[PDB]
Design a protein around this nucleic acid. Sequence first.
RNA 1: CGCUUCAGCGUUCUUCGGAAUGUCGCGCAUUGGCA
Length: 178
Amino acid sequence: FSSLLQWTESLWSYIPSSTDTNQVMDVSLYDHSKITCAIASCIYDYLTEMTKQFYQEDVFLLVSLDMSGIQDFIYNISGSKALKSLRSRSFYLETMLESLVDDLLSDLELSRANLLYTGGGHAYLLLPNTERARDVLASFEGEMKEWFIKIFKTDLSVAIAYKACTGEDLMNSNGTYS
RNA sequence: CGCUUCAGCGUUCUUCGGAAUGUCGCGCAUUGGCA
């Protein structure tokens, strides 16, 4: 599916989600498909956990992870070899962030569609509200919290927090999204 | 038999241009970088 999700992104980025419509065509078809695919998996996991009333109940979790001391780590250079270190240290933090995201999605059995957006040193993911997914976050955070301690003794850290959000919250009904 | 008046006067007193220019405006070695 990962190759398919890349395939959609390359072609459907220019395509608008809705055409010849009064509302703004500010959403791409790939974005519309990606959000639908991510939400569909989230709903399925909740149902496996076991319309208008469906929106009211809390079916999704808002989960974000942020690295700590990323800017301190980049300039940790002695300066004996600073030009190469600065480039690679930033790259390592960027790729290590992707590795953490991929590891979390693999445990939850979710595609890259669930990663709604990323910022340097940060990840923004949409996950099902199922208690099984909540258990994984406890396991995943504890695993990566110990791994960073093993490798970087307080030089780097990650924290994960999850907030339960209902279906209407995603639609931004009553301004609850922001 | 000389005597006297006059003893210099009026008028230019410097002028017109150039008023600095061109060249260099830190370099090297160590630090860095690359191997």
